[PDB]
Design a protein around this ligand. Structure first.
Ligand SMILES: NC(=O)c1ccc[n+]([C@@H]2O[C@H](COP(=O)([O-])OP(=O)(O)OC[C@H]3O[C@@H](n4cnc5c(N)ncnc54)[C@H](OP(=O)(O)O)[C@@H]3O)[C@@H](O)[C@H]2O)c1
Lengths: 495, 495, 495, 495
């Protein structure tokens, strides 16, 4: 079809890279059944990188059948669990050995500064190595009462899971969906993001070396509304895992519900940053900045609502504004930058639209709002203020580099304000007074609370939203609760 | 309205009973806002007992607002948990003290033989006393890594839950819905069954003595399709708990899903009884009988599929048939009976319809199928056989006193047969060979497996369905997992 | 023998009390086999209260044999654990109903102000009710690997335990030794303190009502060096529980070790109070005072080492001294007092001896050291200062109302000082800076750390010493670990 | 001293091996301070292998000081625990890569057939890899009550542990003592067995590659009564771990007790094998044989008490005797052998002495008792029978290839017999009846029970003795409980 399984790619920073194509089923790279293809575009070159075979419903079905066999033939299940664990551990090491290209690849796929993409690579590796350690720790329970009966409970894997990957931090999105599944004996039919698919497929070449038997991991990519329904509406799949926009979330929920499937979801949201008169402003400023510009602002918990205690208001804003002048924005393959590119023009247009809405509803613009020149998806960062609590700009999700700063008069009041919304994912607190910190942390309702820090992740700590914003958890030991179900056996003994 | 808050009821076995009416909100008995009423009928007299005020949407809304205040004013939450526990414990004792009438009341409400209704009263009491013990045991977790950070996780109550009660075993249905909620700090708006509402309201008179503050428990009754939607579609309710028919289950799921609510469900199902040549037939026969006639057959796990190993087939059926001749059926207030009445003519007609279908599709009738005379909802118990695996009668749910017996040739084959269905709630095994018992129990897929016993319940043991048949668990410690969610806090320490 | 089983006692505050005598074996009150007796003396009257039969080795042996039967006949063990739990719960209620006399009795036994004895009664009741809740929560574990094996672990009670009661807080000492035993199925041969034996026996009259079968609880009293060896050196007893002086602790350890017994111990110790410039002095002063005068100073963790940050030194001491002038000392049956009497002249002489040593080695006396008049065991409270770290007075245990205050220059230094000793039971911190509190708490080594509070107990929180000072824990769920051992069973399945 | 740090060793099966000498302190190989040496002898050649420097008290002290620094400088402790884990994992792989020599070395050290030494190498590797997985799973607990307080508990490493290695299975003895320590942050001063020291030192060469910082692992060897006291009586060591003979156990307990140290111990013991008429004799015979001849009989749980149900007695003994004729005994470096050599002439003489006692007290000898020729420590295996329950031979520990077979009449009686002793380490059951197996397993008291299997180990399953025979556990997750202690912190919040 004039599309060889691999294509040589030249990377801008001196690297030779061979990029695979096709779908990955039963550990083989294959062309799509209908012979369709689509073009992959570089976000800060505005140019073609390569062509990838496009999957369709026909291939989705094959992947499902493969996953079934992998589970039902017992090769992944009827084992000494320690072996399930060892294979994952090795895979993690194989990845570590190729770090230089992997970081470069991600940078190419999404514009994330190379200076930080490296961080995620290290994080994902530690995550995988750790989670492998649970393979032989998933215990059942003995219920012992009386002298005539025996009772036990045992945990079992649910079956085939369908999973959807977004495009914010592809490496982590990958690991958080696959490792919790594999470790308990589940198999996966995974949908890769269409806009940034390359790194996800590349790393699959190591699966056969790690020794994961064919059929356990199946990777399919193609356009979302097509592939998505092909997976979520199939009768075989038992569980559905999705992250994204609220409206989509509801829609998926209605369809999945029809089959009585188990469904987990994570939506985006908004979060407060409460700054008290006790904290050193110099430190608070650096933390607030990180929290709103990191990864081009395309972050699920990069809250924009900043509340500053009145007595320090004047200085927080004086310094914050001036500090922003130094945020170097530019080439993703330049270790000196901080801000990179946006994923595509879609999001770019959306962001700019809201900037204009803000100006018309009556928000005061302090800085930015301009496109950063004519080429590449870049936006000059903004600050808004003197925004009344009823403004649309403080209810809506921007998912970009826009921050709004308002006033704070009393602790009880800030708590009440912080809690008045449907999007309970995270919150941050800046102070030194032990009483205040404990009080606020235990009264503000959010998935997670960060004290004198922000965007600080660790593999042992769970993450997910409190009410409307979501159902289930992405990380740590508790994450495993949603991949398992409990069976119970009771027996009567005559004597 | 000519409906006093209480009415004297004379019970047939020498008891004086005062029956309350009205709705129970903020610990008060009140008349319904629209002044509507409906009549309560005696299942084996075919006669009127009393009139109850009928609730409507207007009252449902009030109950919701009450529940909200109970939660948000902190009186139930900001406490030393041990006190939450103590109040529940006392309530259980107050109930124990009135056992004689309570058993009589249930008998009046549903036709269950008095000889067994007593059992459930004792079971529910032990259940409640035990679960009270978790009030101060619901611990969080400390995550300790590095020397610069602190991490903890804490469990929090979800909020207001809506709950629906069926009509099979009202006392237990009550306890399994309320106690897991109360123990963690949740409040409840509960819908009582319309056909058998009396015992559920009577026992509420003790709530004010136990000391549960007003607003925590709200009891509303009225017609299902009205009240039901009034609760499930309200924006305040966070969780929905429902049990019932498969079709209804799906419907509720679609509506609840629209609000991204947390939804748990239990459907009915079917179950096998696998009888091996190793077991003593005399014992197997008594266990099989219990499993199909207990509580008039209106039992969620009273499986009708009986598989008998070929070498003993002739004797199992000879004895089983003859044994059934002794199952005394009659007056619910007669300690000598075994079988009581059916809930209503609706179910009666349904059962008889299927008996006729069986005869026409080609099933062989061994015994029964007749109505047991002209008065009261009674059915003469049946046995079918020589039924091919494709028959409608072995796919459908009867939910009544109908059993089908077939042949078994080989253990691998019975396992494969047992698993071929969507309704995975329970299974039973009858044998003496340790190898066989362990093999089958770990290969037949079901919510729960009973060895050499049947319908044997204990408060420490969990219960619920494996795949299609349900989501979540009704009893024991693991039940609490679905009433709680986890929050996490991470903090950075400078030094 | 002219000693009736009961004697009328008149209590000074209008109460009629009947006091039992004899030993309590198999739920019966019996006279001692050798017909010996001893006199009980009132600590602040200096006068005889009553005579109690004195036990001997002969009776100790009977108690042991009784305990054996209680265990081995299965009546306490082969049950639905929930029943073990219920009996304990009731016993706790029976005690609650008689609170007025119980508080008065303790006051009579040890001089503790009535104003605080009431507190311990409430605490012990909550403790017992809570721990009863574990009767049916002590679970085993299912180990599930491979497809050919089965593995489980189950916890079992150790057997007959011997226990020793000290004389500081008899009600709690009682509960902390008995309830953890009973809840798991162990039986106990308990030695009651000889100097303050009355309340311990009185409450035993309720055991037969609660429904604890005879032989489970056996109460014997008599002189320590006799009865003690009679228990610790017997071949039947499996576990030994002791609290007391360091030297005694070692001695018991050497004897118990000879039989390979399981031995737990708690010794007294010393603790620092670190006061920072950040804390409000008014609050710090009240907490420091409580911590050194509560319960006449006869408290295992009433640390005397006070470290005050230099910048506030002058005011801490000015206020502290003046504040002490208000500590009313007097009649135990006067709600207005704070300080009561010492247990006996033995301890009184010991305390005074050390005061004199202090004066001679060179400590500066600020106040007190005088006997508080000629009648009753009362001591005027003291304060010392300008005491060099090498002084004997800051190495030795006083176990009385003596406090020493020194200087603090730097946080690292105070941590290093705090940790330089063998007696690691507790520590306290007074501040408002979250960083400091977290740092110190995680660097000072002690059994337990209290922040901005002192002597603040709760049934859910564990307690015991870090290194030399002890082995094992007195309270909360973890306490149960030392009353149980684990059995494991593994089985191979052919198919 | 004419002793180079390494010596070339030629192995009989074609291998070139370089053997190190000296002590291993701070990751260096050093000569002993007093320049003493001793000779290593080959058990089935009766000949010199090499000379090893002999350690003394002076070196023991250095090792202790090194361990202290390793702990107190924080390099092993103040880390992200995941790194502690990774280093151990790598070490395990380095060992796996050198399996061929390691198995050969052990064979040289103790005469164990090469055909089975390989098994232990594989077992130890899996064990180490698994336990590494707990590095970041050792969690603390959050206690959450009220609204004014905070409570947490955290686990901390005890400190420097002293450990003693026996000579039965050196590879496992090594791993079971070191890995549970390292994983929690403890450091170790280890005493290597004097009679079989070589493999233990060889493997230490990989510690520096794994990356374990110097001072964490210190290996010292020399004569037992000297080195032993040097460690157990030192004031720095906090914990003592010992396995061995009962008398020694008691002695160590008395000394360690003097310092209030934490002491764990495992003694040998005896165990029953209960054979029922239901089991296939062919299988029972093979399992009984393994259980008494494996590893030359020098096994802690190789029980010799065989009880055979009367109805099958004649055939069990006919077959068992004949079967023993095939147990090939010979050269350790011959894959076809089953039985190898005894450790030394000491044990050889002891065994033979008991054979003679048996003959004189009146036991009937069925077979063996002869020395297997004049060269090498070999014994021809024996069988005794018609031995009355009072015979010394059935009370004493042989720790060699001697089995006694008696009669069994009734299940209750065998249970009562099985339990009549102080040495409760293990028991085995042979049957097919589920009721019998469950009954006996839950009535016979032993550390562990094996059903239709024997000597079947797995890393996830715990092991240790029930009463007299020991205190503590060697394997699995529960083993970690004795290397940690709990600290608790409570804090009061003003608001
Ligand atoms: N797994 C088991 O059941 C097991 C294991 C080992 C021994 N044993 C028993 O040992 C019996 C005879 O062997 P044995 O007399 O040589 O055993 P032992 O003296 O009890 O052996 C104990 C081990 O620890 C060392 N040791 C002994 N006493 C010590 C002390 N006071 N201080 C420090 N270290 C000390 C010894 O090292 P050195 O003697 O080499 O100096 C020896 O290897 C056998 O019959 C067997 O019952 C059983």
């Amino acid at each position: 079809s004039h599309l060889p399984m691999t294509v040589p790619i030249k990377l801008p920073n001196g690297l030779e890279y061979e990029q695979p194509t096709g779908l990955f089923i039963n550990n083989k790279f294959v062309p799509s059944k209908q012979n369709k293809t689509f073009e992959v575009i570089n976000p800060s070159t505005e140019e073609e990188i390569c062509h990838i075979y496009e999957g369709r419903e026909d291939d989705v079905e094959e992947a499902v059948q493969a996953a079934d066999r992998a589970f039902s033939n017992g090769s992944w299940n009827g084992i000494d669990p320690i072996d399930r664990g060892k294979a994952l551990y090795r895979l993690a090491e194989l990845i570590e050995q190729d770090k230089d290209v992997i970081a470069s690849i991600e940078t190419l796929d999404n514009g994330k500064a190379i200076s930080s993409s490296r961080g995620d690579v290290d994080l994902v590796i530690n995550y995988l190595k750790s989670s492998a350690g649970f393979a032989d720790k998933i215990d059942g329970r003995m219920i012992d009462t009386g002298r005539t009966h025996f009772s036990y409970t045992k945990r079992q894997p649910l079956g085939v899971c369908g999973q959807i990957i977004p495009w914010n931090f592809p490496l982590l999105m990958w690991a958080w969906k696959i490792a919790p599944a594999l470790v308990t004996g589940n198999t996966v039919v995974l949908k890769t993001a269409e806009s940034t698919p390359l790194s996800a497929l590349y790393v699959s070449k190591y699966i056969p070396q790690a020794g994961i038997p064919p059929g356990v991991i199946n990777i399919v990519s193609g356009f979302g509304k097509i592939v998505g329904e092909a997976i979520t509406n199939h009768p075989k799949i038992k569980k559905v895992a999705f992250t994204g926009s609220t409206a989509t979330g509801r829609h998926i929920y209605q369809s999945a519900a029809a089959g009585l499937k188990k469904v987990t979801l994570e939506l985006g949201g908004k979060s407060p940053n409460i700054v008290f008169a006790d904290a050193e402003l110099k430190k608070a400023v650096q933390n607030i900045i990180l929290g709103i510009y990191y990864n081009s602002g395309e972050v699920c918990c990069a809250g924009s609502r900043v509340y500053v205690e009145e007595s320090i208001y004047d200085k927080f804003i004086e310094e914050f504004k001036a500090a922003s002048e130094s945020i170097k924005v530019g080439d993703p393959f330049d270790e000196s930058t901080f801000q990179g590119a946006q994923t595509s023009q879609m999001q770019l247009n959306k962001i700019l639209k809201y900037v204009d809405i803000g100006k018309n509803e009556g928000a005061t613009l302090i800085t930015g709002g301009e496109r950063l020149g004519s080429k590449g998806y870049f936006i000059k960062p903004t600050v808004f203020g003197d925004v009344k609590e009823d403004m649309r700009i403080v209810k809506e999700e921007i998912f970009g580099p826009v921050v709004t700063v308002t006033k704070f008069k009393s602790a009880d009041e800030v708590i009440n304000m912080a809690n008045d919304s449907e999007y309970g994912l995270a919150a941050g607190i800046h102070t030194s007074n032990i009483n205040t910190a404990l009080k606020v942390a235990d009264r503000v309702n959010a998935g997670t609370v960060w004290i004198n820090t922000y965007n600080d992740f660790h593999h042992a700590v769970p993450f997910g939203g409190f009410n409307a914003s979501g159902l289930g958890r992405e990380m740590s030991v508790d994450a495993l609760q949603n991949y398992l179900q409990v069976k119970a056996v009771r027996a009567k003994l005559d004597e």
